[PDB]
């Protein structure tokens, strides 16, 4: 059955429709082996892709309720559609949240998974923080952050400035430091230190991986200048 | 332009 | 919820493009039983196309993988089962479709212009059926989707410009179920330069709220004469 | 390219 719902996983990501692929995986991990490398980027697109086509929709609704300040009428619908989106978005985030705890994160039994785990669990708070408004959103801000901090301290000790997972942590928690702590000496500086980091240790670079971390660079940069200009 | 995070839906 | 409001709605749901709260929105608007405006028939028509377009899209997709898995059982047989899924789906979809046309559009139909766009609107959703049928199934699902196409074609050659929207759009889909339906390219052909040629002729009669739509679709008749011609 | 129908997705 294992071996049968990635493949079905893969059908669905090639059909993309990746509710039923988020279903396939969602059913993998569930049966509680860890993830080998290709089962854990399969789950992770097919859940970025359901979550973000509601971030997408809610960003939309709320620039249009945002817009529509001084027409009451249309604002209110803006504003009730928008509350129907976060419903589905916080399913959703919960739902992968769920995952993690109870399954990816304590069986992980190598530093690179463990890593990539608690990204993704800050990750997912960090969506749930950016619809979180008044007393519980200190508090999802606080897990986002406590877990990407632990990620943080176990890539700087475990992995190659150059690791695709340790730039992409960075690109992510420095984006966490800008837009959801409104920090951004602390979002560029982290930015900036990883992508020194990595160009001092170009060598740590291998053949399979270098394209996912030199396109990695090439986005923290551009973070930086678009936050800097 | 916006800013980046990873993964991304596309790509 | 009153029809104005449900406007609203799927225009915002468009914006978010969630298709099918848009879809959902126009079919409860067709359901209230007054003829559709304009924007009404035109919100229903990209609702339902990204509804049933999706499964389209994926329908191709997982039928070839299905085709290049001979040999291969327990794929093939995901595969197949997969594609009969969405093969559900999607003629749920035509079918809700077809229902609203046949028992509130149609028969309430007052001018030609929407009597045409209903027509033709019928005619697309039975192709997509004859897409996915099989059989002597097949042969009357083609059946349906022709007498629709053809007479939606003879109203506006009737009652309609050259340049008119409708009646190019008409065109261009009857000259596809020709071409991809009917296996005729000949047909295909003749039915889209005639089109293409008779709104070349008379350009003087697009307005400004026409003339975007009238030269595009033009655009995309004189494509499938280049594609089809190569 | 692919042959034109509309609507369009
Ligand atoms: C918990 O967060 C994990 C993030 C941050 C780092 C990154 C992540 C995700 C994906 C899974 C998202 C985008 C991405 C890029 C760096 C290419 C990867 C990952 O790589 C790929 O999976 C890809 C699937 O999409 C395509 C276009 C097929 O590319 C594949 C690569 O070849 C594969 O290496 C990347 O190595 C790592 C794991
Ligand atoms: C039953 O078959 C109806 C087809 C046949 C021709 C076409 C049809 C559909 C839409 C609704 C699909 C694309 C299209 C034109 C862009 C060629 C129209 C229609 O135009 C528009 O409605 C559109 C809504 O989608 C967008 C891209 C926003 O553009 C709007 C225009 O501005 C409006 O004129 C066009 O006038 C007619 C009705
Ligand atoms: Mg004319």
């Given at each position: 059955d294992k071996n049968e719902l990635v493949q079905k996983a893969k059908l669905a990501e090639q059909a993309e429709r990746y509710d039923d692929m988020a279903a396939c995986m969602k059913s993998v991990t569930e049966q509680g082996a860890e993830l080998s490398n290709e089962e854990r980027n399969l789950l992770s697109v097919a859940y970025k892709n359901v979550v973000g086509a509601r971030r997408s929709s809610w960003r939309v609704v709320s620039s249009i309720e945002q817009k529509t300040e001084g027409?009451?009428?249309?604002?209110?619908?803006?504003?009730?559609?928008?509350?129907?989106?976060?419903?589905?978005?916080?399913?959703?985030?919960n739902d992968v949240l769920s995952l993690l705890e109870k399954f990816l994160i304590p069986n992980a039994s190598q530093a690179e998974s463990?890593?990539?785990?608690?990204?993704?669990?800050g990750d997912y708070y960090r969506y749930l923080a950016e619809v979180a408004a008044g007393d519980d959103?200190?508090?999802?801000?606080?897990?986002?952050?406590?877990?990407?901090?632990?990620?943080?301290?176990?890539?700087?000790?475990?992995?190659?400035?150059?690791?695709?997972?340790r730039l992409g942590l960075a690109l992510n928690f420095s984006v966490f430091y800008y837009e959801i702590?409104?920090?951004?000496?602390?979002?560029?500086?982290?930015?900036?230190?990883?992508?020194?980091?990595?160009?001092?240790?170009?060598?740590?670079?291998?053949?399979e991986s270098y394209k996912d971390?030199?396109?990695?660079?090439?986005?923290?940069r551009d973070n930086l200048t678009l936050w800097t200009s | 332009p916006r800013r980046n995070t990873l993964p991304a839906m596309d790509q």
């Open positions: 027409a009451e009428k249309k604002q209110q619908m803006a504003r009730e559609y928008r509350e129907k989106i976060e419903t589905e978005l916080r399913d959703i985030c463990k890593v990539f785990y608690l990204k993704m669990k959103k200190k508090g999802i801000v606080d897990q986002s952050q406590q877990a990407y901090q632990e990620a943080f301290e176990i890539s700087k000790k475990e992995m190659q400035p150059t690791h695709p997972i702590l409104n920090s951004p000496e602390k979002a560029c500086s982290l930015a900036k230190t990883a992508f020194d980091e990595a160009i001092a240790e170009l060598d740590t670079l291998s053949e971390s030199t396109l990695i660079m090439q986005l923290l | -």
